[PDB]
Unconditional design. Structure first.
Length: 132
């Protein structure tokens, strides 16, 4: 569902901007709730599959949400700030999940950690770039 959504333009009308940003908001909150249910279940393949598809999600967020952050930044500041404070909580959560991957030293898990890590470093440095 999240990969299908296309970035518009800065010339685009306010209605589609607001609607697609609220779609991104429910997407990131759904990602948050999907990640938060991890803490109670163990079972190696569950953490493997979520650290796998988490990565492709965060890559989607880099490639396909940030153009919308560039276009609707001047006008929808409260909305984009809501998006970013929503994303920081799942960023810290994914930091903890990668830490959980390290502490057990699971070979299947620790393969999919560094790409996820570098995408989080890229997104946080991009967020710093956007704030200035």
């Amino acid at each position: 569902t999240v990969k299908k959504i296309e970035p518009g333009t800065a010339a685009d009308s306010q209605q589609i901007h607001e609607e697609k940003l609220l779609y991104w908001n429910m997407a990131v909150r759904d990602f948050s709730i999907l990640i938060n249910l991890i803490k109670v279940f163990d079972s190696h393949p569950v953490l493997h599959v979520c650290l796998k598809y988490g990565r492709l999600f965060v890559e989607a967020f880099l490639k396909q949400c940030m153009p919308l952050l560039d276009f609707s930044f001047r006008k929808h500041r409260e909305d984009v700030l809501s998006l970013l404070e929503t994303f920081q909580l799942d960023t810290r959560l994914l930091h903890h999940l990668c830490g959980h991957s390290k502490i057990h030293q699971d070979t299947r898990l620790t393969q999919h950690v560094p790409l996820l890590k570098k995408t989080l470093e890229l997104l946080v440095c991009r967020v710093k770039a956007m704030l200035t």
